[PDB]
């Protein structure tokens, strides 16, 4: 006799996620003011 | 009685020997017209005092 007919492919197992990727570093901070300003002559005499 | 000349000073400086500061600058007692207390500067004694 004819053998039984073979069965259908099973199917295909499950996929796995995906995971987050972590935070990027702080901006560069920024330096200080740009130097002093020019420093002032001092005015009169300042005695009573 | 104080004075103060920069910013960060922990503790008002005493005026030294034959100075004065006033309260306010009208309500003091001799001083030359031609000057104010604002309170960085103190101000040196007059003749006679």
Redesign the interface.
Same mark, same amino acid.
């Given at each position: 006799p004819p053998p039984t007919s073979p069965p259908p492919s099973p199917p295909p197992s499950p996929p796995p996620p995906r995971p987050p990727p972590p935070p990027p570093p702080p901006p560069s901070p920024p330096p200080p003011n740009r130097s002093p300003p020019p420093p002032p002559p001092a005015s009169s005499a300042?005695?009573? | 009685g104080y004075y103060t000349d920069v910013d960060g000073l922990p503790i008002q400086l005493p005026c030294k020997p034959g100075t004065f500061m006033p309260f306010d600058t009208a309500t003091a007692n001799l001083?030359?017209t031609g000057?104010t207390v604002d309170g960085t &500067?103190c101000?040196?004694? &007059?003749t006679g005092t």
């Open positions: 300042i005695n009573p | 001083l030359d000057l &500067q101000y040196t004694c &007059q």
